[PDB]
Amino acid sequence: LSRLDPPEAEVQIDRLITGRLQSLQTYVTQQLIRAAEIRASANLAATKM
Amino acid sequence: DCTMYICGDSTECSNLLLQYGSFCTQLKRALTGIAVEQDKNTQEVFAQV
Amino acid sequence: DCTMYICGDSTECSNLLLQYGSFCTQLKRALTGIAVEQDKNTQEVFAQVKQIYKTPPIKYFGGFNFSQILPDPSKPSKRSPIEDLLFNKVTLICAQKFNGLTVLPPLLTDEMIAQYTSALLAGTITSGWTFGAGPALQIPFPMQMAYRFNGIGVTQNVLYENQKLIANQFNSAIGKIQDSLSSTPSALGKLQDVVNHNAQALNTLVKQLSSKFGAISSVLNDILSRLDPPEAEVQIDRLITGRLQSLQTYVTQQLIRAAEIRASANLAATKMSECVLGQSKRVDFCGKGYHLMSFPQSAPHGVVFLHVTYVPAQEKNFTT
Amino acid sequence: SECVLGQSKRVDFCGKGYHLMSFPQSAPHGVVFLHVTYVPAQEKNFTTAPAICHDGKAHFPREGVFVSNGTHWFVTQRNFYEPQIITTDNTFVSGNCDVVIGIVNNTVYDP
Amino acid sequence: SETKCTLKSFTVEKGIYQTSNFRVQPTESIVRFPNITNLCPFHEVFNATTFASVYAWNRKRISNCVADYSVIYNFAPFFAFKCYGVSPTKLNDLCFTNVYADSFVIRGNEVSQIAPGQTGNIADYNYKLPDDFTGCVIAWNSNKLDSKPSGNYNYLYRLLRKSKLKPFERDISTEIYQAGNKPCNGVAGPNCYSPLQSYGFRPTYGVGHQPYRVVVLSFELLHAPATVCGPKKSTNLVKNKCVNFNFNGLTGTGVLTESNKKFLPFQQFGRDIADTTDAVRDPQTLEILDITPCSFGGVSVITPGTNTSNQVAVLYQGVNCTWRVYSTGSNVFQTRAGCLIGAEYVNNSYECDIPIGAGICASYQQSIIAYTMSLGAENSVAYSNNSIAIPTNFTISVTTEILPVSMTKTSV
Amino acid sequence: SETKCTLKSFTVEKGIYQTSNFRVQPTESIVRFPNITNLCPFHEVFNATTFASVYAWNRKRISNCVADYSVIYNFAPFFAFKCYGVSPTKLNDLCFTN
């Protein structure tokens, strides 16, 4: 914010926003992928019980 | 959280975030669904009596 | 149809879309895959037999009453009262139709599903369980009752001395189940959630379409009217990238949900083939307690199973 | 595991019809199964009764059911036709001749 | 041939396929403008006399008017038309909600200082602009007329300002010497440094000491009222036809129908939860017209194997036919899946090999025929209270079942 | 009312619901810099018993120290200034090499 000017600040903030958004999306999709398999294993465990 | 991870405590970052606007609501919804489902997941593997 | 969804009637936007490589083909192929898999899913949970049976008109099954399960010809649609209550209890489209987000009708209508379930009921009522293996063999209902009783370690002489009590308890319970289902309106939550999650995801995408990704505006046409072409390529690109990211997120979530739905449908198919056409000795798979039989009933996007069971009630202590 | 190393009575899991055996074979990326099954072919219709009266005593079969070709009565198993003479070893007696419904009157031989 | 293109082969197999959509084309264009056409008082800041300065920005609130190319470009030797929003190549066929032609007459030595990035006198809290500033920059010359001999001292500018000035805000005062440790306050005198800078440019000076008048514009869009744009022939509308409609700067494509609801007396831009313009008011009259786009569709081709024949039957998804299906063919049907042309209809029941939708299936008979579903053979088994059936022969039957286990590994 | 606003509907049935965070605001601000501020040579050339002649003005370059702007407004005879470019009010916030 102190570097450059607010007209020239948003030309660099956008890349940071896109990178952090992409990282968050990857984490969430991986979480869904793991959660589906853990639910399948838990259902098998319930059937065994 | 949506904003505390994507940015700092700066108003122009939140202003740059709301252009997309309806993105992190899906994020929070998916995480809450995963949390509630995995909370439920023990009930049908232990509470059978 | 991604090409019309990203950009409307402006060939310059299409020419910009050609710069991004073969990506719409993947989306269309995955959507056709999930559609055809969901169409194929019902055929292994319903079409388990290849003979539409018909019950005889005179109902004389030892005092048992089956009016709440068999079809009723008074209603023009051949549905039992349980099916009608199921249809009644479970419950802007032009806007999503106007942007290429069309829906497709399924292969099987509800009348054919009702026909399949009625045929399955006739088979499991008048033919015992031999019709799941070979030709249908006629068996009167008390004898099949006696053999099902013999299946769980109770000698068949017990049924023949308490026939009227069995009939009365069965009929009273079948009468009770309708009001028991209708009293709590929150018991149908699975199919309700299945419908509304997909509906809200589609509406979320449609509302996401009108959101500027840091460009001059959201509409492509007025921006094309204002900005001069070879500097507008740097303008209309964030729209394309953001809409493609939204589309990729949507198709990934749809695939994720379809996997779970197909797993549940496979479980339903195994349960139908192992608790209707037979009598399983697996504890807590087809009901609660010692298992006696099951009956299927159709419902909008799915099935409901009536498990008929047996429970000892009063007891006395002795020395062994 | 449940189709080759043993015999399962779960219908439509180890094959079609009553299950008897299974043999596995390999294939590039996966496996194939052959399921030796058993199905009944042709049938005949008969008249049956749930129990037999004798001296005010109701009889019940130890296995199978009673059949009658019109002439006399026999008792046979459930999945194959093989009649045999009704004898006290093949049946057991409990109760009397009024509680059940549809019982016929006949005689049972005792050696 | 389209199916052969999409399959990228020379022989199609069977069944449903897909191609592009229907996309019925529009007919013509309709303009919709107010009938009132006065003349706009432009060029008032362009050719009269010495107009204004940086001390009095031209805050002209231009009312309803009709402005075009003819009044503007009154003098050819302009300067760089520094675009910020709409390009200077097109200034007609779009209407503004308002316009504010700001003006100042300083020399043309520093033309770039008006930029949001390029600073100067603007940086020390003079006349400022926001980051967007969607109007252009018109830095037209003023030499040999405002170039008064020995300097136009009546033309002047402010050297500095003590505190931060918001863009578009007037600060014309005494501007005393509030700075410095000495408490002069503009009265004592030493190192006062008043913002006063009069101009001493003789015409013998360089081109950097010659006046260049600067006028700029400012507007916005996406609003129902308009006040100024060029002329056009607003031809009368067409009822229930796929036309290209333009309404005073907002375009579109669809069919226009008579409204059923009631608008508020000052409301003319109705919409709904679809977030798009459902209806709009006539620019000339009170007439309200609802807008709905021309019909799309889904095109699919039905064929048997090319080993057998090469005839086809084409279905348009989700389009009523009875209807907007262009030309015709042999037979037209009205199934619930949409329109279908090419295949006949017959009440006889058969099994399915080519599914369509809602229990309709088509196949080769010597022609492509269609029918409804047939679940299977009807049967009914006799029943009594004392009848039984027992088998006497048994057959041994063997079936197969295939299952994949491992898929090919990969590395990147 | 906050739950009503964040649910985009006018009725809520039962059960827990997630809403925004607490986020206590900060109290005040503290900067911190070392006490030692060495003096730049502006006052070293300003203050002298004798001064150079106007025939030849000796060049001096001042670099790599702390400015200490108070030394400019320190002397007694203060009746001749013409400040241009960077005012003494806006002096001690900008960075210059020499």
Numbering used by the authors:
A (entry chain B): 978 to 1026
B (entry chain B): 734 to 782
C (entry chain A): 734 to 824, 846 to 1074
D (entry chain C): 1027 to 1137
E (entry chain C): 294 to 615, 630 to 672, 687 to 733
F (entry chain A): 294 to 391
Question: What do the study authors state?
Answer:
Since late 2022, XBB* variants, especially XBB.1.5 and other XBB derivatives with a proline on residue 486 (486P) on the receptor-binding domain (RBD) of the virus Spike glycoprotein (S) started to dominate, which demonstrated enhanced binding to human ACE2 while maintaining extremely strong capability of evading humoral immunity.
Some immune escape mutations, represented by F456L, even convergently appeared recently in multiple independent XBB derivative strains, such as EG.5, XBB.1.5.10, FE.1 and FD.1.1, indicating strong selection pressure due to herd immunity. As we expected, all three spike trimers mainly showed two ‘RBD-open’ and one ‘RBD-closed’ conformations with one or two ACE2 bound. Compared to XBB.1.5, F456L mutation does not substantially affect the interactions on the RBD-ACE2 interface.
